[PDB]
Amino acid sequence: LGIIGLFVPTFFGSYYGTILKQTDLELRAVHRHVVVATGCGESTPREQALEAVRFLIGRDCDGVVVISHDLHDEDLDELHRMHPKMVFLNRAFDALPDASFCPDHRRGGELAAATLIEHGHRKLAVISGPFTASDNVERLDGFFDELARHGIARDSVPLIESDFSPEGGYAATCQLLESKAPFTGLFCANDTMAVSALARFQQLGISVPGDVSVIGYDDDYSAAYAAPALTSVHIPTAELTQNAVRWLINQCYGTKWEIFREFPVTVSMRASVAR
Amino acid sequence: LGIIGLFVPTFFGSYYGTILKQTDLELRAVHRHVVVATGCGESTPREQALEAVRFLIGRDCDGVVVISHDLHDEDLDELHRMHPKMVFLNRAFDALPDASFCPDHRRGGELAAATLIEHGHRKLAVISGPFTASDNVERLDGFFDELARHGIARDSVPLIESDFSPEGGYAATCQLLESKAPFTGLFCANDTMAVSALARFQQLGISVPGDVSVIGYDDDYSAAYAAPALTSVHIPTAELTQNAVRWLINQCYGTKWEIFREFPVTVSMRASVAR
């Protein structure tokens, strides 16, 4: 058919924009197209992804690129037997490992904690994504491993579960401030929620990095222009996507790209974190 | 083929995300798909759009949705004779008017000026998009018509031409501050550049709305979470897209949607504008 299908949970956020751009790019390079699909309807986030991916498979896309933290591992196996030419981004796929392209989130969380701790912060707080998102769980695991090495118990750290969205981050920041739990450093599971945190703090006169140091995750390109410029853990999303899509193109169209799966995660130091 | 093609100059910005979402939505509703294409390569923005649209037409999409402010009117006519089943968003198409779905940008600019003027601002400044973008020219025209009604000459207002991007807005704000031109109120052609302006002002201790009142355009959903919450001119992008795509679906697949082309533009008052 000359088309590869692509599922993303939403078109918003520079993170998903990056995935869309790179997929379109690699396909254009081989003179082929991309059909995009996102969650629609009144079903649950999970079922919305199942229906969307099945909709792509039904169109007979030569290959399907999939990213979703709402799908359960068992769903990945089902979708894969329905269409063996698939690649999964940001999550593992044990039945067929190289069909999975995922950065080192454990290391990512570790760096977030180290940034804060190295700046003298001992009382920290966290606003995360859904507890059922594996990319989030490993992100937090790494964060708390680093905290443990410094004598800080996971159980003593205020943690608000959220959904990675702008409104979710805003509500989570409010819930945190309302709890009265003390904290001088805040870790947000993604830049989107971090920006909303900066929004609330500004509304209440809570200075950043003055009174609170905030660090995000992803290093989406909305961060450099946050107020103040958002310090964020840099995830190699463009590179992993480029390689995930190239791997798929090899299987589908006979290209011979060399595939790389290891990229470093670093911290983009800006102005939201201070001593 | 059961596919409609869609060209957007970029996947970034909630404005384009809205267009992508609504297009995907209306097509899913009729059990069909969308192939997306954006500008790629080292050609000029204009030629990148010409090549991308021709790439969609070459795949024999049943219909093609196109939005670009880099294309010249003559390009719209050429692309249209290559594929008569096309719809154009955010710009006019004189040869075939109902193939064009565009909000009232003149009125939009007018409201931006009135908001500022009604808040007592007499010394204003503007950061616009490219002068060659028709949606921008009418936006500015309306802005300056309102200023003229208040005894303010277009020629006395600092105007920095930019490109609608985050980095462009940042650079334009810097150029403005460096010029030393006085101003207490700033109008940004789009929320993206407005957010970058808020970024610069925060870096220099220039309070908003304290020292400078800032108003954006689009009312993209990144505005409510800007710091401070960005007051913006609300453009009915979701509605026009929904109707533009429905109109196209009628012509392509036999649906019988009633089509509406008139939606009001209003101002979303938040916290970036004060007396």
Nearest to B17 among A12, A40, A226 (CB): A12
Query: From CA A142, how far away is CA A217, in angstroms rounded?
Result: 13
Sheet holding B185-188, edge to edge: B159-161, B124-128, B185-188, B213-218, B231-234, B266-268
Query: From CA B247, how far away is CA A198, in angstroms rounded?
Result: 41
| Burial track B69-84 (b if 16+ CB lie within 10 A, e otherwise) | bbbeeebbeebbeebe
Query: From CA B193, how far away is CA B119, in angstroms rounded?
Result: 22
Q: Identify the H or E element spanning A125.
A: strand A124-128
Residues linked to residue B35 through DSSP beta bridges, in sequence order: A35, B5
Please give the span between the terminal C-alpha atoms of chain A, in angstroms, as a whole number.
56
Overall domain count for chain B: 2
Q: Identify the H or E element spanning A266.
A: strand A266-268
Interface residues of A toward B, Cβ cutoff 8 Å, are 2-3, 10-12, 14, 16-17, 20-21, 24-25, 28, 33-38, 40, 55-56, 59, 166, 170, 195-196, 198-199, 201-203, 221-222, 224-229, 271
Residues B59 and B108 in one domain: no
Rounded CA Rg of chain A = 19
Residues 6+ apart with CB under 8 A from B163: B129, B130
Residues B251 and B160 in one domain: no
Residues A15 and A96 in one domain: yes
B269 phi, psi to nearest 5 deg? -75, 120
Q: Identify the H or E element spanning A89.
A: strand A86-89
Burial class (CB in 10 A: 0-12, 13-18, 19+), A153: exposed
Q: Residue for token digits 């401070």?
A: B228
Residues 6+ apart with CB under 8 A from B19: B6, B8, B67, B89, B237, B241
Query: From CA B252, how far away is CA A88, in angstroms rounded?
Result: 34
The four Cα atoms A26, B66, B1, A46 give a dihedral, to 10 degrees, of 70
Query: How does strand A124-128 pair with strand B3-7?
Result: unpaired
Nearest CA in chain A to B270: A203
B184, part of any domain: yes
A159 phi, psi to nearest 5 deg? -135, 115
Residues B130 and B226 in one domain: yes
A77, part of any domain: yes
Q: Say which experimental method was used.
A: X-ray
Residues 6+ apart with CB under 8 A from B51: B40, B41, B43
A274, part of any domain: no
Query: From CA A27, how far away is CA B198, in angstroms rounded?
Result: 37
Residue A146 vs residues A119, A153, A187, A189, B200: alpha-carbon distances, Å: 14, 10, 13, 16, 34
Residues B174 and B228 in one domain: yes
| Nearest alpha-carbon partner for A261 in A138, A97, A143 | A97
Residues 6+ apart with CB under 8 A from A241: A18, A19, A22, A23, A89, A101
Q: What is the resolution of this structure in A?
A: 2.0
Query: How does strand B63-66 pair with strand B3-7?
Result: parallel
A275, part of any domain: no
B30 phi, psi to nearest 5 deg? -105, 25
Give chain B positions within 8 Å (CB) of A171. Answer: none
Three-state DSSP string of chain B: CCEEEEECCCCCCHHHHHHHHHHHHHHHHCCCEEEEECCCCCCCHHHHHHHHHHHHHHCCCCEEEECCCCCCHHHHHHHHHHCCCEEEECCCCCCCHHHEECCCHHHHHHHHHHHHHHCCCCCEEEEECCCCCHHHHHHHHHHHHHHHHCCCCHHHCCEEECCCCHHHHHHHHHHHHHHCCCCCEEEECCHHHHHHHHHHHHHHCCCCCCCCEEEEEECCCCCCCCCCCCEEEECCHHHHHHHHHHHHHHHHHCCCCCCCCCCCCEEECCCCCCC
A24 with B17: Cβ contact below 8 A: no
Residues B87 and B201 in one domain: no
Phi-psi category of A264—alpha, beta or left, where left has phi over 0 and alpha has psi -120 to 50? beta
Residues B123 and B195 in one domain: yes
Residues A129 and A157 in one domain: yes
- And the tokens for A270? 């800006």
Q: Tell me A13's DSSP state.
A: S
- And the tokens for A227? 């107020």
Nearest CA in chain A to B31: A55
A28, part of any domain: yes
Q: Residue for token digits 């995907």?
A: B24
Query: From CA A62, how far away is CA B132, in angstroms rounded?
Result: 40
Nearest to B20 among A11, A25, A199 (CB): A11
A24 with B33: Cβ contact below 8 A: no
Give chain B positions within 8 Å (CB) of A222. Answer: 166, 222
Sheet holding A213-218, edge to edge: A159-161, A124-128, A185-188, A213-218, A231-234, A266-268
What range does the domain containing B66 cover? 1-103+235-255
Q: Residue for token digits 């309102």?
A: B146
B203 with A12: Cβ contact below 8 A: no
B260, part of any domain: no
Chain-centroid distance of CA A198 in Å reads 19
Q: Report whether B103 contacts B134 (CB < 8 A).
A: no
Q: Tell me A246's DSSP state.
A: H
A221 with B2: Cβ contact below 8 A: no
Give chain B positions within 8 Å (CB) of A166. Answer: 221-222, 224-225
Q: Report whether A78 contacts A54 (CB < 8 A).
A: no
Question: Residues A102, A248, B29, CA angle at the centre, nearest 5°?
Answer: 90
Residues B83 and B131 in one domain: no
B45, part of any domain: yes
Nearest CA in chain A to B25: A40
A33 with B37: Cβ contact below 8 A: yes
Give chain B positions within 8 Å (CB) of A225. Answer: 166, 170, 195-196, 199
Residues A151 and A250 in one domain: no
Residues A141 and A206 in one domain: yes
Burial class (CB in 10 A: 0-12, 13-18, 19+), A141: middle
Residue B70 vs residues B24, B136, B142, B164, B237: alpha-carbon distances, Å: 23, 12, 21, 12, 19
A22 phi, psi to nearest 5 deg? -60, -40
Q: Tell me A230's DSSP state.
A: P
- And the tokens for B199? 């970024």
Query: From CA B174, how far away is CA B193, in angstroms rounded?
Result: 12
Amino acid residing at A10: T
How many CA atoms within 13 Å lie on the side-chain side of A247?
A: 21
A199: CATH: 3.40.50.2300
Query: From CA B186, how far away is CA B198, in angstroms rounded?
Result: 10
Q: Report whether B7 contacts B64 (CB < 8 A).
A: yes
Query: From CA A102, how far away is CA A140, in angstroms rounded?
Result: 16
Residues B240 and B189 in one domain: no
Q: Report whether A31 contacts A239 (CB < 8 A).
A: no
Give chain A positions within 8 Å (CB) of B59. Answer: 2, 33
| Nearest alpha-carbon partner for B192 in B140, B230, B139, B240 | B230
Residues in chain A: 275
A89 phi, psi to nearest 5 deg? -105, 150
Sheet holding A3-7, edge to edge: A100-101, A86-89, A63-66, A3-7, A33-37, B33-37, B3-7, B63-66, B86-89, B100-101
Q: Identify the H or E element spanning A135.
A: helix A134-149
